[PDB]
Design a protein around this ligand. Structure first.
Ligand SMILES: [Ca+2]
Ligand SMILES: [Ca+2]
Ligand SMILES: [Mg+2]
Ligand SMILES: [Mg+2]
Ligand SMILES: [Mg+2]
Ligand SMILES: [Mg+2]
Ligand SMILES: [Mg+2]
Ligand SMILES: [Mg+2]
Length: 281
């Protein structure tokens, strides 16, 4: 229920991944179609799309006869470009990654954790290991420092270059050195677990894995305000107007407030989103 971030407890099957939602939608009894966002953005017909063999899905989708649409597995957003699909009266709900239009019919869902089962990707297999996240979350949370910073600036520099430039040299920041390996993943999670805060700026897409990775480890992610994030304001996320003038005093106060407040942490659990889709069946 409504509870404190510190009180969060996870089971092995709780973690949100887009594969779990995609798999959920394969059972057509639940009356929901999952399409990779690319096939919406680059549609060759206004109201007809297909996964074109993505996840071995060759079905042609007729959106005029689709009651619930679900899009993800893409850093692409849902924006004004898709307004003609959104205005279809037969569509009761559009569940999407990267909601970027202020329309009440479009419902954000968390990017969550990397899809471990991405076929020939060793990187997806390593970072997608939710067991390792679960294991670390059950160890004693021993705070080593205020904020964890482990950021590849390339993914979206206008924000990420400022974070590295402004805060790399702060005593209250620990710089993380990402090693893409089974040992490296464990070390990364342990580091992040031992901080009150993690920097979770947007990347190529608005939503990032770091945001969700942080919340499962009961570490507070820091994220720039965006319409894409506006339905997650009942999660203990530190939303910032910009990246300038973060201090030890500012973060210590935000820590005391966020940890004192009660949050809808059920939204971190895949079951929430299964039931939310079933609600529009
Ligand atoms: Ca301000
Ligand atoms: Ca500021
Ligand atoms: Mg649980
Ligand atoms: Mg899981
Ligand atoms: Mg992109
Ligand atoms: Mg509009
Ligand atoms: Mg590290
Ligand atoms: Mg800024």
């Amino acid at each position: 229920g409504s509870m404190k971030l510190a009180e969060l407890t996870l089971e092995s099957d709780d973690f949100i991944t887009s594969d779990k939602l995609f798999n959920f939608c394969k059972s057509t009894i639940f009356g929901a179609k999952y399409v990779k966002t690319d096939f919406i953005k680059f549609r060759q017909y206004q109201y007809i799309v297909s996964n074109c063999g993505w996840r071995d899905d060759t079905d042609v989708v007729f959106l005029e006869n689709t009651p619930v649409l679900v899009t993800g597995h893409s850093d692409y957003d849902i924006s004004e470009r898709e307004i003609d699909i959104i205005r279809l009266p037969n569509i009761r709900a559009w569940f999407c990654q990267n909601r970027n239009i202020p329309h009440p019919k479009v419902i954000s869902f968390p990017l969550g954790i990397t899809n471990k089962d991405e076929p020939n990707s060793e990187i997806h297999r390593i970072i997608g290991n939710t067991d390792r996240i679960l294991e670390v979350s059950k160890t004693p949370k021993e705070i080593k420092n205020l904020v964890y910073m482990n950021i590849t600036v390339k993914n979206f520099p206008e924000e990420r270059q400022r974070i590295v430039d402004l805060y790399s040299d702060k005593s209250w920041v620990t710089i993380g050195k990402g090693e893409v390996s089974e040992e490296g993943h464990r070390k990364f999670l342990e580091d992040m677990y031992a901080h009150k805060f993690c920097f979770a700026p947007r990347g190529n897409g608005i939503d990032t894995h770091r945001l969700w990775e942080s919340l499962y480890l009961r570490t507070i992610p820091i994220v720039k305000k965006h319409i894409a994030m506006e339905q997650f304001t009942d999660l203990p996320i530190l939303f910032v107007n910009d990246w300038e003038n973060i201090t030890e005093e500012y973060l210590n106060e935000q820590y005391d407030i966020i940890m004192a407040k009660d949050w809808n942490l059920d939204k971190l659990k895949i079951d929430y989103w299964y039931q939310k889709i079933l609600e529009y069946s």
